[model samples]
Target: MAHSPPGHHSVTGRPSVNGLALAEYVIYRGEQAYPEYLITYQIMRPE
Candidate 1:
């Protein structure tokens, strides 16, 4: 099973490492692939 469980929060427009603002939780589980999850982030800078 994926080690990281999804968190009930909105990280968009929030301060974090670097300029990445939008953050999300991802998980993957398969017989061929090992269970894992990652906290992904995206750029949401207003121009």
Candidate 2:
């Protein structure tokens, strides 16, 4: 969770901290490595 400089919305690239979007989601059970996160997903643009 790296926020650049702070006071910036990744949605509209504004100076207000609001309206956060869900880009990716992941879940893990246990006995796994750091890079291993069950099944992950992301928002994709259809071509």
Residue-level lDDT tens digits of model 1 in 5-25: 365222234447867566554
Off by over 4 Å in 1: 1-29, 44-47
Find the candidate with the highest lDDT and give its number: 1
Q: Name model 2 segments beyond 4 Å from true.
A: 1-37
In candidate 1, the residue pairs with backbone N, CA or C atoms under 3 Å apart (3 or more residues apart, or in different chains) clash, namely: none
**What is the TM-score of candidate 1?**
0.19
lDDT of 1 at 12: 31
User: What is candidate 2's lDDT per residue for 11-45, written digit by digit as tens?
Assistant: 33343345474344322323332655687799899
Pairs of residues clashing in candidate 2? none
Model 2 TM-score (2 dp):
0.17
